[PDB]
């Protein structure tokens, strides 16, 4: 029966994502903030896709590193072909869902990866940041508050739901996210911001002394 194989593959994927770290991408007044429990100082699980499009992932590293590189390549090609403002987070999320579904179906080994694509409004415009979560099977969900991925999801998600704050500043949002992730110190923490107040490139890494200052 194909269905038995499908259930085995699905459970393998949820197990693989289950034994990983946790990522929280939460929308705040200045844009989107990504916080991940990343002990390594070299492997980067949060990156930039395009001028206002940011990428976060959970699961096996090389799978979502290849997915990140493919998404960056697609965004660059699309922005060159037509225009920079013609690249949106929706198209990238759709391409990610397409390729994840194709990998799940055709390929023998499913990708044990969960992806988050965040888009913020351009400079001089006002729009609610849009977060798209793409799951292993290719399912895509638009979540308008905050994405939590990898590890134990239920407790951190529930803590965030209890302590949700609309239009929170960056410092409060960072404290909220690190407290939810604990439910951790400054080290082993990778953070970034899609900053809607920057003119062209919204992505900005907050490392070292700034993380200590904000905490």
């Amino acid at each position: 029966s194909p269905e038995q194989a499908m259930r085995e593959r699905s459970e393998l994927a949820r197990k693989g994502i289950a034994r990983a770290k946790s990522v929280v991408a939460l929308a705040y007044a200045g844009g989107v903030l990504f916080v991940a429990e990343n002990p390594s100082r070299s492997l980067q699980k949060i990156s930039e896709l395009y001028d206002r499009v940011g990428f976060a992932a959970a699961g096996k590293f090389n799978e979502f590193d290849n997915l990140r590189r493919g998404g960056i390549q697609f965004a660059d090609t699309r922005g060159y072909a037509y225009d920079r403002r013609d690249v949106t987070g929706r198209q990238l999320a759709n391409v990610y869902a397409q390729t994840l579904g194709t990998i799940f179906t055709e390929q023998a080994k499913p990708y044990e990866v969960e992806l988050c694509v965040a888009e913020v409004a351009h400079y001089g415009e006002t729009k609610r940041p849009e977060l798209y979560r793409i799951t292993y099977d290719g399912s895509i969900a638009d979540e308008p508050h905050f994405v939590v991925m990898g590890g134990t999801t239920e407790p951190i998600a529930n803590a965030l739901k209890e302590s949700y704050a609309e239009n929170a500043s960056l410092t409060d949002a960072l404290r909220i996210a690190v407290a939810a992730l604990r439910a951790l110190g400054v080290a082993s923490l990778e953070v970034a911001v899609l900053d809607a107040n920057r003119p062209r490139r919204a992505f900005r890494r907050i490392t070292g002394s700034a993380l200590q200052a904000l905490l």
Partner: peptide
């Protein structure tokens, strides 16, 4: 996947 997403059937919705």
């Amino acid at each position: 996947g997403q059937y919705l």
